[model samples]
Target: HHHHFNLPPGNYKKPKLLYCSNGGHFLRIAPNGTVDGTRDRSDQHIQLQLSAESVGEVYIKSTETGQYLAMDTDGLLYGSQTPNEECLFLERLEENHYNTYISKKHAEKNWFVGLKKNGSCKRGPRTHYGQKAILFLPLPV
Candidate 1:
């Protein structure tokens, strides 16, 4: 008897890069879900870089019996009661800073927000644009 081997075909297509100059980041997380800044997932974190200077990060995570949305910025963190209805907003906060907001409607939402002086919100040192968006989802419970 002879043994045979089977191998899956390979893809030779190159990956494409996506770029953004100004846009708000969005993220949606469900119960028992986690988002990684380094990976992409359906239920993970969503990030948006409004420009070479400003950025937004959003995520959802599980709670005792509910969930929460986390929003962060350069040096501030704020949390609001999850609205019963989906919430969205657009605002211009500064000369070049704008925000478009969305949230899941609910109560007792547990989420966290953070801002960094050198936050990951700037383009590359040698490139005019170096912005990226990644979605992450935790393993199912």
Candidate 2:
């Protein structure tokens, strides 16, 4: 699977499941702008925008709500077309061969997109390295 990390510019796509390590969770944005998981489908499939600034710098948008994922100061996510820097994320790779998105502006703050027992929305995953919060799926092979 090519992350296209060192490749030259071209059209590309990646079907990723923003998986939560604690459960078989996949990030889904509710209409009210809540972030949670333990589910999956086409809507959870994310697309990438290789923003001009650099590679892997992206705007993570929802295929379902058409809302760009914007993390608030409180680590809550909202869908919006008019996202600020909080909406920007660096697609990071974890040692276990999964993925994580660290905020572009405030890497130390914000949520790793964690959730509840019912696999619904909530926050409190302190860091991206946490077993519960630091997880995602990058597919190809």
Candidate 3:
């Protein structure tokens, strides 16, 4: 099978390059789900699979490790075999053309996937245009 998946409706089928809206790097995660909003593209451009299991929620997985991208109670990102509430994100379209993945976890209801200047991953809130709020673009054809 090819890398591209024909994900069902209410999902983002395009394997994406999640460029940090912070304007420095992309969102890359380790197999253990250790991720940050830092660094430029690599051999693998932190390609992601955004899938919706039910209404109003989506599962973000890594195409390389086959692990679901999940968040912990402490707001850290990780990869896990099973998905929980931490793996769920509400896809919101930003006016600047990037999509934001908002977590469904209680304490992190408004937190967005964000990056830091030092290539570390951080969570940004939705109330403002914080540097971590993101924008994405497609892979080169």
Residue-level lDDT of model 1, residues 47-75, one tens digit each, is: 22111111222233223223433333221
Q: Write down the lDDT of every candidate, Cα atoms only.
A: 0.24, 0.56, 0.60
TM-score of each: 0.21, 0.68, 0.73
| Reference-based lDDT, residue 74, model 2 | 69
Query: How do the residues 20-139 of candidate 3 rate in per-residue lDDT, one tens digit apiece?
Result: 646567777676557765455773528777776765467877777777877777666777778778888666566545566666673334565666656676653422333444444434
Pairs with steric clashes in candidate 1: 25-48, 40-135, 41-135, 41-136, 44-136, 83-105
Q: What lDDT is reached at residue 25 by model 3?
A: 72
Q: Is candidate 2 or candidate 3 better by lDDT?
A: 3
Clash-forming residue pairs, model 2: 25-38
How many clashes (backbone N, Cα, C below 3 Å) per candidate?
Answer: 6, 1, 4
Residue 111: error of model 2 in Å? 4.8
Relative to the true structure, candidate 3 has a C-alpha RMSD (angstroms) of 7.1
User: At residue 128, what lDDT does model 1 achieve?
Assistant: 17
Say which candidate scores most in lDDT: 3
Q: After TM-score superposition, what is the CA distance of residue 116 in candidate 2 from its true location, in Å?
A: 5.1
